[PDB]
Amino acid sequence: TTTLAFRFQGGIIVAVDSRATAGNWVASQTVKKVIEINPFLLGTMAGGAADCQFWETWLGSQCRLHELREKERISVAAASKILSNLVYQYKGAGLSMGTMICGYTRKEGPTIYYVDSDGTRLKGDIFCVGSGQTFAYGVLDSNYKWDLSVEDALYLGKRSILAAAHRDAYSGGSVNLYHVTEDGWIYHGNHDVGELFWKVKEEEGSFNNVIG
Amino acid sequence: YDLSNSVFSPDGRNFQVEYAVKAVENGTTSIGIKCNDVVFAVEKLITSKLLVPQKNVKIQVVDRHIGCVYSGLIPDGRHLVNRGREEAASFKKLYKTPIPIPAFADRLGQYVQAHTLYNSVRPFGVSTIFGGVDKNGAHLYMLEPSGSYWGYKGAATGKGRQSAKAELEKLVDHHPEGLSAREAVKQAAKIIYLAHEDNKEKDFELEISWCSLSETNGLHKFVKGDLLQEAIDFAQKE
Amino acid sequence: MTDRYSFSLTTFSPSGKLGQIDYALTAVKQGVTSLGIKATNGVVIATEKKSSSPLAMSETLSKVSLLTPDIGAVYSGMGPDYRVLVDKSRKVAHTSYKRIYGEYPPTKLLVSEVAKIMQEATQSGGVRPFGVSLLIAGHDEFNGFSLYQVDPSGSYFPWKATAIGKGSVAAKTFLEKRWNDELELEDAIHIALLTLKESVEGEFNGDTIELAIIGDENPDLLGGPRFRKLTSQEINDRLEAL
Amino acid sequence: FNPYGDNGGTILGIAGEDFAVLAGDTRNITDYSINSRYEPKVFDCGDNIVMSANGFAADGDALVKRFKNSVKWYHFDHNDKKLSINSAARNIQHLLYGKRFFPYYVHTIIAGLDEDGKGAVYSFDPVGSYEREQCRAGGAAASLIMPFLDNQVNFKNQYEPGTNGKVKKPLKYLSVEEVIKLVRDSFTSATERHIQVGDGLEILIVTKDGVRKEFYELKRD
């Protein structure tokens, strides 16, 4: 689990892995860790899968009701604060959740909020939440700028996910990419980590320590 | 003074209870006879031949030893029987013994009387004859919409209650030493047949039940089969 | 079986009168003349007693009750209402003041509590005003000796010498005819006895009137209380010297 | 007082191109003792939906009966509209999450056909997270079956001979018979290597025609 998301000129890039393990045994390698809140909002799954899915679907329903009543699309801040207020009621009951609410609105541009099960809610540019968050965050920090193209940002997300999967035993079965623009999200397919590692090693001369 | 349930008249009467008694008067004839050991008999009006025979049982059973019949608004009697079943179950749970007949009568009387204390409800439009057998012998009781109840040697209520009362008084006078069970069943059938004459131009069905020591082991059972046919033939002969 | 009587039964008339309170006052006015006189060393509360039946034991019913060891009360109006209100006042004197501050409430505060209780009956739902007027006689360390009158409307007034009942007007006139600044407890008792004898139509003995006094101290009754209800023999002895 | 227990079962759901297969062992046990040799765990809940909860027997039975009641009420309240597999999955997710703080100690697998007519298998966790998968095994023998299915269904770690591991083995269509053979072999291996696994295998197959049942014997008859 790495589940990174960052902002750039073209909007928002969200990258996740798909590995779920239980007691050092890999339960699944096809886990969808991105929740489509609505055609204009995405969320990231970290911590408890059931809590994330259930409460983000509930958030999507609340956003649908808000847009029906107000005849206007809800902002990212409002949805993030609704989710945070919902979670803060259940604090101390054992809920575990770490989510990145990412959305592109006309008023606020591209926006990313981080909300945890402890009630913290903060707006930021780059976020990485997971067991292998450190490697991906380091890669992003080393190769970030508010000038990247869409293709460069997608490759940066893939590279960060690949580094996290390589250096963390609990991360990496596949890579899922999403690009959030003012007109909604675009899905950029599922890429196998095993093939991606060899492809990156062949193209870029990285991972010399690994024999291939 | 006849618009609310809990308003006294200038002479001290409650007209809603009297109107409930008037409603009871329109009901069918139901009688109960106590023997030395008890026997309950009811007349069911066959409004049309479309009704399935022996499918509209009116006599109800409480616990395994109480039998109840009622005249008036049948749903009110059913509600009262449900309340009595609840009270009997509570008593049996609390004390492990079947509820005595006087205790059951007191519970029903308290319930009916409480249904006459407020204007948010209306008094029950039924009169109930109920009885059975307990450790102290065989008991018969009659309860009215006002909540007052009494023990009787023989009781009757409904449209043809006067002829039934006259027959019961004659039977009591003619049997100072009591009656048996089968003789009581035959007398109940005869009294029902005689009291049916208040309608004449309407077919009717006779339903009989009994609850006595011996031949029923102190439990309440419906009289069905050859005994009921013998009772019907005896009633028709008279 | 539901109450469904949440609305109030006392309302304002177009002329600004409260009908139920006026009717309660009318019921009070057709009662028994009860009077109270405040003195410099005590307060006397006297009333007349009726006999429902010749076979009835009059001493089984007391028209003057002890609210606190220093506060007593008398009534004019409906007896059962007075009894229920006395029980309520006794409960309030403990559950609201004594169990918190460790002392018996002063007379004014107890009168305020009783007036609040009687006012709650004139505004809540599904009730009627109490058909009684109460005279409260008490003593407290800081306020001295006090006498109060509480009406069915819940309004209480302090009085130096007051009377209620059928002969309320004549008794009030007699009391106001000569009320000096040096009244004593025994002088107040004598004046009360004279006024009650004038108001009553006859049979003025110790078993037909009931009197109580507040003042001084009775350590002999401690087992002291300032409330003393005079016995029939003492009333007869005082009437012998009348 | 411990309100939970383990009955030691093993179930497996495989989604085909136009069919679904849900299989399970029939052994019910507790603490090295065999409660029963034939206690079915896979039930036909209606609308061509087959459900199986594994783990705590009582919680599984309660969940199955609640889901059947939900299907009945859905038919009552929506003019007998057929319940889709995704709608059933979401309803089961809500049922599981309704008692998250006192969760069912079961793992749930449901199978059917989607709105396009293809096999669909949905897997659930005890607290109510579900995902659609092609092959999913649950129980105490899941760790002994999933690698075998990955090797023999997805052809993982297999390459075309003569290419020196440059071209992966292409995926091929598998008939229902091949899925049945793979399921039987996996359950036989699980029976061989797991003490809690193996008294009889019950398989439910869902197609457009309906649901059909097959049974096979295992060791410890």
Next chain:
Amino acid sequence: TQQPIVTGTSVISMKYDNGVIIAADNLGSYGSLLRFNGVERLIPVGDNTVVGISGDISDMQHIERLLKDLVTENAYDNPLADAEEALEPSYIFEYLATVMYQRRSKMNPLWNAIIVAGVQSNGDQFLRYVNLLGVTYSSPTLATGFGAHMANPLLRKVVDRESDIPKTTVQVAEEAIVNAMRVLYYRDARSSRNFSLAIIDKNTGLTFKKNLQVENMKWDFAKDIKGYG
């Protein structure tokens, strides 16, 4: 509720070609003290149901009172309460299982293991098990507690699968049950020498045998054991 005080012992049961047989002892042990004797743990319901209860006996009395109340309730306004609308083993087992599961879910369980046996109205033998936690299952042979470890292996030697049920006569099943009871008295420290046995047959009906005693025991060889070396 939280811990049993007075506890029962193993209840055993099996199916034969025409019905069910269920047996249980009559001990009311108080831990290591055999405090109470002559305690009937086989409750007949109707003319076709027998309920065997093992574990806490206060809860046993509670649920037998519940069964009596259910029988009373089934007869209310039911002219066919003795012919076709009478209670069946399946209905009673479903009610008992629902009650047990509801008690478990509230963390206030009934510390019992219950075996319901009988013959259905269509002639099919019903024999099912329930306990605390609401765990239910069925088998041709059933046993609760200690008898689950010793009585079941012997009974399964006669009725091992479903197809063996039609081949088992009542005499063979009764002999197997008696032998299992003798073995349990041999090897269980909370067992008693006296027990009751109920047979439910589709043709004959309900046969109840009380005050049975374990007999034909072997103790002679114990004369040859001396010391421990």
Next chain:
Amino acid sequence: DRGVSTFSPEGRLFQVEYSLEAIKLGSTAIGIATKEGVVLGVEKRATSPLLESDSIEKIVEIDRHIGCAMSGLTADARSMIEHARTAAVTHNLYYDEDINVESLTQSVCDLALRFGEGASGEERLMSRPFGVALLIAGHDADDGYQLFHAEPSGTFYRYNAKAIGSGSEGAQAELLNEWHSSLTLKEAELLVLKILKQVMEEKLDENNAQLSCITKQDGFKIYDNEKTAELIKELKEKEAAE
């Protein structure tokens, strides 16, 4: 009388009939359903020319595939619309699918029938029936395009074409004479505009009449003033030509 749920001697509830009478005084709302969409038209009444006509919302969206129109007491319909939106969103949340139009209509009718007696053993919340009738248009994969008339009585009907409001009689007669099972969306819009012009006492303009449609492809949409004006122009040209 003198009771919210009192039966009349003829066997009807007074409050429901009075609510129907109140609805009879409302503005005209028409709905026509075809095999390629459902058109809902409403008449907007302004008590003064200074009112802004764009602030009158008598056509409300329940969900992308379900729209609603109201006639009668427009203030009472806000709670009904809120309940309908909540029910649709809840159904989508619980089943990952769009709720059927008939199911939503039944939910709305249960809400309207509720609060006098629970439809599923619940209590009451309001003390009088709703005073607004609703036309609910929608599309679902089960039956197709559906139009429902919902009344405060709790009963609903499915109509091919339905008009409600003050001019409901003549509009319904025209719908009976005009509607056939092979209409188009443009023909339905023209017919709605024609009937609205006939019913309305004032001249038909784009500032006093509003149109909306629901189709499978584009969901539920509300026409702007320019489109309504061009449709009115086309209707006038067709009337003056043929």
Next chain:
Amino acid sequence: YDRALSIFSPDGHIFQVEYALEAVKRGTCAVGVKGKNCVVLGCERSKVSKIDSHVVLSFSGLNADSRILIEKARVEAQSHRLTLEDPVTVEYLTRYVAGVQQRYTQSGGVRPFGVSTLIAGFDPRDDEPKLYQTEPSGIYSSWSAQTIGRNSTVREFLEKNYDRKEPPATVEECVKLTVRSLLEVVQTGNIEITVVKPDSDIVALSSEEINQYVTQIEQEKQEQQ
């Protein structure tokens, strides 16, 4: 207390709501005039309350019921700011007030509010003025000049002297029109004006400036004519 005080009549009317409207048509007149910029609220014999920094409310009818409604609206605005991190718009607040008023007309044991409300302001990050009125029945609408109050007339005058496809683009003209419309039914000079401009620019004109406006209006009337 749950008696249905407001129920339908045989002619399909609710008499309690109509009597609340009659109660509304008894107090001082309140006028709201909207121009190209700024909104002017005029009140006769504080009658203008700031619900938030950008919205103001005027009432006609019962004072204490209006106080209750104002408290509810202020609490709702603060809750909206706390939850959505965005100041409430005029339309949302008007909808909330109208919903409360309607809900009070369909609950047992209560009577409808005898208050008619005028809400004026500007939406956040916007410059278009917004003016709404809510009736005791719970119906709300948008206007440019309404005059909810009844003072024995003003509506006709404002209909005559408004628009012509040209709003009063200057604040001074709007204030003058409001003062003249108030003076149409007021003989003394008992007149209060509050002006609202974007960026939370809510001000109240002093009595001296209102007196100057009245004197100028009188001079204009007596000079040209």
Next chain:
Amino acid sequence: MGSRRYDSRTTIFSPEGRLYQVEYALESISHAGTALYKLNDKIAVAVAGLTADAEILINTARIHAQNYLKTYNEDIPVEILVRRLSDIKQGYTQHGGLRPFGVSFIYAGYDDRYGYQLYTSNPSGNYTGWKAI
């Protein structure tokens, strides 16, 4: 026939839009005397009509003032207390089914924001400040 004794439905409007109970209470107060309690150290109140309800309202006002003092560690402004009492009196004129209070109040209070002020309130719940009586 549960309870049809509702005394003219106290909290309803007249056909002319008036409240009968409030006007009758005003008549009762006008028939009373012509206008001595301490709410706190800085506010005093004079009562007119139905001294018992006046005492109840005065006790409620004292509790409210002491609660404000405890919460903010400052003396309550006169306007806040007057508004609270007026809202309490108005609450009985719209819901509850009970009769309205029959007390007229005259408050005189000093705060740090206005420097001596006077108010009056009636059963209708409307309170008005006055330069002089």
Next chain:
Amino acid sequence: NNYDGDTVTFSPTGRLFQVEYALEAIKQGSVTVGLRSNTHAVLVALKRNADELSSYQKKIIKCDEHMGLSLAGLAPDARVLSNYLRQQCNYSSLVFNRKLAVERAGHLLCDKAQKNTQSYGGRPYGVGLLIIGYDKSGAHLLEFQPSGNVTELYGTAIGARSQGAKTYLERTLDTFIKIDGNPDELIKAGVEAISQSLRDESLTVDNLSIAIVGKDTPFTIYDGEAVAKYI
């Protein structure tokens, strides 16, 4: 009348006029006929529409796979009663795993109807019901009135102009009881019985609904083109 403002008031002759008005509300409804035999039970309902542009209101509601009903009068009350019956049948099937008997449902409906005729603040139901079912005792048909009176009959009819159908059923009582091998013959008998109640009307595929239950027959409803061959 002074004894008509509520259901908790008795008339001087001992009558409840609110219950009588509820009964009269049934007479203003469409005619529905029910009949049964040893093996099957059949309900035939004539539906109504608001006008030519509206559909025909449903008159048959399914309660369980072995029990159903047909209504005459206020539809919402019928919906409430049907929901209650569905809940009771589901409770019986879950707790005891036994199919609910028709007589038990009749008793439950009687009790629920009675509870609404004795307490202030409520009103009696305004719909009559014909309930058919099949259980271990065979096929059963029951008639339900809002007063709480439940009767068991071989055949009955409720609604408006119901006397013709009832007279036809009484005349042909000895015939339709023996119709056991042919469910369609029983349906034909029911259709011919309801035809006697038609007032210058013709049965169409739009205003005819036919529900049937039987031994090996789950509760099945025929409407529209399904009833083409029964006309």
